[PDB]
Amino acid sequence: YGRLVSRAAIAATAMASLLLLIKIFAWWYTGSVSILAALVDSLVDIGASLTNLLVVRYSLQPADDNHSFGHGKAESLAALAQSMFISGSALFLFLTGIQHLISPTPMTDPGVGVIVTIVALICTIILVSFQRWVVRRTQSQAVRADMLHYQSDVMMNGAILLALGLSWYGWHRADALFALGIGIYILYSALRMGYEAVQSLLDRALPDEERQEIIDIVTSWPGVSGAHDLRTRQSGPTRFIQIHLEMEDSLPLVQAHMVADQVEQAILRRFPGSDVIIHQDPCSVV
Amino acid sequence: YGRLVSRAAIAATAMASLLLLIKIFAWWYTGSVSILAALVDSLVDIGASLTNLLVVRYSLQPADDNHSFGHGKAESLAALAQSMFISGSALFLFLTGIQHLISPTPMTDPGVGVIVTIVALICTIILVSFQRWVVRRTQSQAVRADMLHYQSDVMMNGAILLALGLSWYGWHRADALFALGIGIYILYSALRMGYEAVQSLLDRALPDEERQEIIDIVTSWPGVSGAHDLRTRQSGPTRFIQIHLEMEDSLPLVQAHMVADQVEQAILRRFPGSDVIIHQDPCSVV
Ligand SMILES: [Zn+2]
Ligand SMILES: [Zn+2]
């Protein structure tokens, strides 16, 4: 089920060792060999790992079973933050700004910093295009998919992509660095993550689809006329009422369990939800 | 049910007109009559209203029924923020600091500001001790109960509570203003709200109690030996399997619906959950 196809391990590893390795380390600057580097979104990127790592190691048990009845919502939650807040807002240490005053133009910023071994990384892209494998091999219910924090925390598209002496003087970041955030942050986490997130409100019961599937599977048994109601949600959950809305509308006998249970069972299709549950109603809302 | 006892209206009003009135306005300073006042946690307190107001006006329908299947989790969510973040962290614009350097001591802060008509408010306490009525008349599933943002956004316990010439020179805020945050913020939202919040992971299935009640009600019908399983959560939700784990362990007939439905029904006790649902199992996990 989750060897590959489900959160089983696929969702176990990435930002649980994408981070335990790539940006566990990559730099030995201002200390031994004292050339300047102010970027330590490294220890800042480290919160990101342990965070997710442990958090997903909790998106992940049968529960505090009693209390935490049966969880991992957890992730969707630990997405909500990363998203809207703390990225998709990590955007806002540049919405625009430095474009007009004596800053990006002819003087202040198109000169300083010809000491760049920042190219040391951008290799790291390796372990986004691995977080990328995680994606639909199974979304860590897309919780990994804060990844794109990296798919833009590896957006040195000014750095190692300069318009050095061809047309743009110091307008190198005024674009090909400004929109960067805008439509890959606002319309990133500050929707995306800000969403699976927001269905931390269980709802979206489903995508009309397995909605569809679901129904037609149940609609079609021996446990026929008597489909009453689906309701649905994340990591699994479905449920419900049916049986004989033609006569076995009391008539039958509890044999006619497994029959639902057949149904239920037959709502395998997925990998799964619960024994997303049947109340097996005889007598008819008509 | 919710006239008074449930979120019906009680949860409709407070921070949906606690804020629409109290700090809709209270001040006309630097403009007409130009005495100084830098505090506009007023327009900042206004986000707080509309926010909650509208949000609770959504903690509150049958759903985007299809998608948002049947919601209001919403609040618990809109608590999570207020809490841990954006208060219980609004604490940290003072953990301590101004205690030692020439700031609170003999010179800088125990002198400036003898112009205080800040006493204009502290009346506002009126509409916390109304948010206080909201509490258990029904917790707006304690979402209102970000209120205590006010129960500490009305913590002028330096202001209009000075140790002016009795023992403490300028040590007036170094205490009776420092701990203020600590153990009414950290151990406030940054647990409290940071919690109902975190059970945005449905879980806490319940408080062993109505857990208890629940069970013994079901345990005790004509729908006897055959209690299988509770599972539980917020605004209502319960569910489950039972019937005849002594013989009507297939034997009976779907008459024996309402019998669960009796049960279910009889899990009135609360105001309620769902028709927190029964799968009525004959043949026995034994
Ligand atoms: Zn029924
Ligand atoms: Zn069963």
From Swiss-Prot, chains A, B:
Cytoplasmic zinc binding may trigger movements of two electrically repulsive cytoplasmic domains and reorient transmembrane helices, thereby modulating coordination geometry of the active site for zinc transport. It may modulate activity in response to cytoplasmic metal fluctuations. Zn(2+) 4 binds at residues 257, 279, 281. It is found in: Cell inner membrane. InterPro entries: Cation_efflux (IPR002524), Cation_efflux_CTD (IPR027470), Cation_efflux_CTD_sf (IPR036837), Cation_efflux_FieF (IPR023783), Cation_efflux_TMD_sf (IPR027469), CDF_Transporter (IPR050291). The keyword Phosphoprotein does not apply. Signal peptide: none annotated. Cd(2+) binds at residues 41, 45, 149, 153. SUPFAM superfamilies: Cation efflux protein cytoplasmic domain-like, Cation efflux protein transmembrane domain-like. It is a multi-pass membrane protein. Zn(2+) 1 binds at residues 41, 45, 149, 153. Residues 27-37, 100-113, 155-174 are periplasmic. One of its GO terms (biological process) is intracellular zinc ion homeostasis. Divalent metal cation transporter which exports Zn(2+), Cd(2+) and possibly Fe(2+). May be involved in zinc and iron detoxification by efflux. In vitro, can also bind, but probably not transport, Hg(2+), Co(2+), Ni(2+), Mn(2+), Ca(2+) and Mg(2+). Homodimer. The subunits are held together in a parallel orientation through zinc binding at the interface of the cytoplasmic domains. This is Cation-efflux pump FieF. It comes from Escherichia coli (strain K12). The gene is fieF.
